[PDB]
Symmetry: C3
Subunit: 256 residues, 3 copies
């Protein structure tokens, strides 16, 4: 059976909010190692890859594998009834018809309990191979959110060009051409504002801004976002929820 406690419901609330606009029906794959999610968005363009590792929970138990077929709009209805600082416990039996969710107030000793009906969802689960990326940009998540948000108003597409010195986001639109250039930047007393760029080779590729804006709905999960460009494989946009757990989005560059 499954039994998993988060100290703050916050983490799960943020996770689901970061996925639900891309994916409606998906499985949460529970086992020894934690709770994973792997699903394409509804248009079958982007791949969503979540791993909530056992260390993120406190405590965590999952004896046998359990696939929790969940509608995310249904789960969002439940999770909105959890406050961010509620102690959250997930429970599910072997061959579950429901996922049991318990939210416990910190002070006033309110206890909320929901039995969310599960459904039969077919898994796809593509193989995510190991990869050495051409360029990796680490920057504040709010800045990447603003960039994609600003350019989206102007264009459907953004060219991302990585160099040793910096990274340039470029687009052409009906109103004109635009670009936003960031270069490596370090603040001793505000290291959270740092922009760090590691380059093994030049990479200049074009991506859907609409998908990038949706990826930036994970901005609440982490202060920093890792943008990983490759000339061979899809872009990886990574939010590390903790030392262990991550929410990842994969997006292929646009090819004629």
């Amino acid at each position: 059976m499954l039994e998993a406690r988060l100290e703050q419901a916050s983490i799960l609330k943020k996770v689901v909010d970061a996925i639900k606009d891309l994916v409606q029906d998906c499985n949460f794959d529970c086992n020894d190692s934690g709770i994973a999610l792997q699903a394409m968005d509804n248009s079958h363009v982007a791949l969503v890859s979540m791993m909530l590792k056992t260390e993120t929970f406190s405590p965590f138990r999952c004896d046998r594998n359990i696939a929790l077929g969940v509608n995310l709009t249904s789960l969002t209805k439940v999770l909105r009834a959890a406050q961010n600082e509620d102690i959250l416990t997930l429970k599910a039996e072997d061959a579950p018809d429901v996922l049991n969710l318990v939210f416990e107030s910190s002070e006033n000793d309110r206890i909320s309990e929901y039995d969310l009906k599960l459904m039969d969802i077919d898994q796809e689960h593509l193989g995510i191979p190991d990869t050495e990326y051409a360029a990796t940009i680490s920057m504040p998540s709010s800045e990447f959110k603003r960039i994609t948000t600003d350019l989206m108003a102007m264009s459907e597409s953004v060219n991302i060009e990585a160099s040793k010195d910096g990274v340039k986001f470029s687009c052409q639109g009906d109103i004109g051409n635009g670009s936003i250039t960031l270069r490596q930047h370090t603040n001793v007393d505000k290291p959270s504002e740092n922009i760090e760029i590691e380059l093994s080779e030049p990479v200049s590729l074009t991506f859907s801004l609409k998908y990038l804006v949706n990826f930036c709905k994970a901005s609440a999960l982490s202060s920093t976002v890792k943008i990983c460009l490759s000339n061979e494989v899809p872009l990886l946009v990574e939010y590390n929820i903790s030392a262990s757990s991550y929410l990842r989005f994969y997006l292929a560059p646009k090819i004629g």
Copy 2:
């Protein structure tokens, strides 16, 4: 004639906002004792009962009975032009065609004056008899607002079960079953957060969440809300605006 001063327009603004989504056309019944309102909602399901007692005003005058036939969307248009800390004065002559409203700024000596046209509205005014309730729950208004709001997303109905120890809100929905359980709770240094439950006998009854959400639009009038359950008479949900005045909502439980 009528002449009634509130120190802060706030009280009246909050009152009307707490009623206008339920009732459009209603009478304000003015006399010696203050200003009352008694009207069913537009679907004729819930009863709204307001009493602004003479002690709430400063000063208060009403020589003879005057029924002020008012459209609440029209009055809302006027009251939005009063700031919360405006000194508010209501005036009306015998056999009035208009209600006169005067809002006086605290500092900058702005004076606003409106003559709201009255209309012919037929009164119903049901007899509200005296009643010994099976269970009375006193809790913070924000908590009851959150509860009803959260469950509304999931269900049209909520079962409220009162015991000595606690109170359970339960519902069944398309997405599953849910419940929120509160028990008696007292904080010495934050007594405003206290949950107090007085029970003469067990009561478990089902009510419309949509009506309860609308009742919770009075949450600004008082930090505390009194929920009064009976096996004989409709539920009473009470907001005490001051020691004297109250806004009350009555709702019959659902019966097959």
Copy 3:
């Protein structure tokens, strides 16, 4: 060629936001003295008159006259990508196809650059003669915003009556009659709250509230607003962005 730096993008952002709901297609007339705008609203009722004088920029260069034909919804798309505290530089060559806009971050050394495509817009540029106004009311911009906003909910029209003592805004609506009366008011320790009224002769005239609400979208440009009434010429509603620069709106009173 044109080259003009603002210390804070804020000024330009606020300016364009204050005009775009009235005017879509307009010219920015650049020369020695600064950057001007003069255009009627889309219904050809109100006249918009902006002057950003050379002293407002730091530094400013414009060798020859350049008319920058701009769509304001297109420019708004660009300016939303400038943060309020960005150093903003406008550039344009002689016979320009584009306006070049550069936004430079204060700390993290982000640089944004846009080439906004210009268009062929015919100028009207009416003669704005010099005028001695019957009454001039100087008051806080937020108060005028609130007044027009409040009365708009009730009426399409507002009568503005100026006297030595004070100014009265009056309207008749379907819900009734309303008025807001301000008188001369001075606070030694909060002079920004002051209401000052200078009268050479009585003036009582009626104006469109819808136009006045739109004029109040310039409220962010200045803490104080100057309302200038005349029995001969259109009302002038003036926002002084700095000692030099201004955004002005002209509106003729309603005549049968």
